[PDB]
Amino acid sequence: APAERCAHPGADLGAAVHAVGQTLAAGGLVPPDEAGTTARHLVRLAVRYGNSPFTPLEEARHDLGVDRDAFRRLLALFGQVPELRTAVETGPAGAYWKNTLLPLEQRGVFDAALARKPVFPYSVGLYPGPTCMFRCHFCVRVTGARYDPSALDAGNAMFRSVIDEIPAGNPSAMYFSGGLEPLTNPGLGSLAAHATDHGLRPTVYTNSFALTERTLERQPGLWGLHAIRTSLYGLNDEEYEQTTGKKAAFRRVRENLRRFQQLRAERESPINLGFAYIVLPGRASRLLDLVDFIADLNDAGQGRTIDFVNIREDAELQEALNAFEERVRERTPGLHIDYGYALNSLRTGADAELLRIKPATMRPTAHPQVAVQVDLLGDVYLYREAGFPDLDGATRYIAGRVTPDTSLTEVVRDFVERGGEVAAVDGDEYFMDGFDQVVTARLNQLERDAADGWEEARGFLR
Ligand code: SF4
C-alpha cells in the first residue's frame, strides 16, 4: 500500500498523501478541506523517521515548520494512521526499529536506562575465552595479550554463579562471545550445559576454528546451545589470511562446519547454525560466493540447512544485495537473511551511514540496564569491545568485578545507585560495538526529547 512504503527512495508520495488523507477524513480526524495538508505533514514525518530514526522531535518539528501546538496534534494523529507506522518500521531505517529499538522499548529496557534504575542487565555477554588462535590486525592478540591459564577454574566457577543469577523471562538474555575466542575455554561446554539446565537458550559467537569433532567430544554440552554463529572472516584461505594472519584457516573452518553439519543431522540436534559476514568496499560481489559456501554446507547436512546469515558493511551495493537475495532464494531458500543497520537501507538505494559516536556524544553512565559483558576475571565491562585483556584505557569501563562476595546483580546495582560515570576520553568510542552505538544514540534522543518537553512522545515511535 502506498502509505506503507513511502519512506523508500522513489516512493510515490502523491499516492501516500492521498491514502493518508482519506484515512484522516474517513475517521473524522480532520476536516476534509485540511486533510491533504495534514496528510503531507504526516507523510513527511514517516519519511523522516523511516530514514533517520534518532531525529530529535524538535528538529523534525523545525523541518516541518509548524507550531509546538500543531506538532503535538500531528504526533497524536500519526498514532491513528497504522499505515504510517508500518512505513517507518519497514522503511530504509527499518533494521533499527524492528530489530533493536522497538523490541527494547516494548520490554521497558530503555525506560529503565532512561530513569537510571538499578535493574538486572537486559543482555549479559559472557566472555569465557582465555586466548585466540587468530591474529587479526588491531586486536590485542597481535601482542602476547591473553588471560592467564590459572584464571580458568575460578573464572568458570564465577560464570556458573552468574548463570544462576539470570532472571526468568528471557531465555536468550545470556550469550557467549568475546573479546577473545570462547572455544579456547576447555569448560565452555559445561557452561553451556549449566545454562541449559537453568532454562537458558544461549548462542555462542565464535570463529569456529576449534569447533572440531575432538572439541565436541571433550565438550558435549555445546550441542545443547540454542545456536552457534560462526564469524566468517573470508571465503577462501587468501581472504582469511588477509584478515586473521593465519594460513589455511578458511579450509579448517569449512572442514569443521562440514563435519558439524553431518553430526548435527546424525544426532537430529535442534541446534541452529548461523554466520556473520562483513561486506568490504567494492567486494560486495563476494556475497554470491557466500551463497555457494552456504549451499556446500547444506550438502554436508543431508537435509539439515544453515539457518541464518548476518551481513553488515565495513559494482553497486544495491545491485549486489539484490543479486545476493535472488541467489539465496534460488540456492538456499530456507536461509534467513539479517541485514545490519546500514545495509538494510542500502537495500532500497537509500543513503545510509552507520552511527559514529564520538566522546562528546557518549553517555558517561553507559547503559548497564541494557547490556554488560563479563570476562574470565569477573570484570564487568560496560561496552562490548572493551572486554579485552591489556587493551589501552579499557579498564576505566569496568563497572565492577563479580567475585564470591559480589554478584553481577550487586555490581550493576552498586554502580547505578552511586551514579557511576566514566568521563569519555578520545578513543573510548571504539570500545562500543554497533549495538552500543544504537543504544547510546537512542538514549541521547530520548534524553533530548524529554528535555524539550516531549516526555510521553519521546523517541517518536515506541
Ligand atoms: S578479533 Fe577475534 S578472532 Fe581476531 S584475533 Fe582478536 S579475538 Fe581472535
Residue numbers in the entry: 10 to 323, 338 to 485
Any passages from the paper?
Each monomeric unit comprises three domains: an N‐terminal domain of six α‐helices, a central radical SAM (RS) domain, and a C‐terminal domain consisting of a β‐hairpin and two α‐helices.
Addition of TDP‐4‐amino‐4,6‐dideoxy‐d‐glucose or TDP‐d‐quinovose during crystallization screening did not result in the acquisition of a ternary complex structure in either case, and an effort was made to remove the C‐terminal His6‐tag found to occupy the binding pockets of chains a and c. Therefore, a second DesII expression construct was generated by inserting the desII gene into the pSJ5 expression vector containing a TrxA fusion partner, His8‐tag, and TEV site. This produced soluble, high‐purity protein without the N‐terminal His‐tag after purification by Ni‐NTA extraction and TEV enzyme digestion. Comparison with the binary DesII·SAM structure (rmsd 0.533 Å) revealed that the flexible loop between residues D323 and E337, which interact with the adenine moiety of SAM in the binary structure, was also missing from the density map.
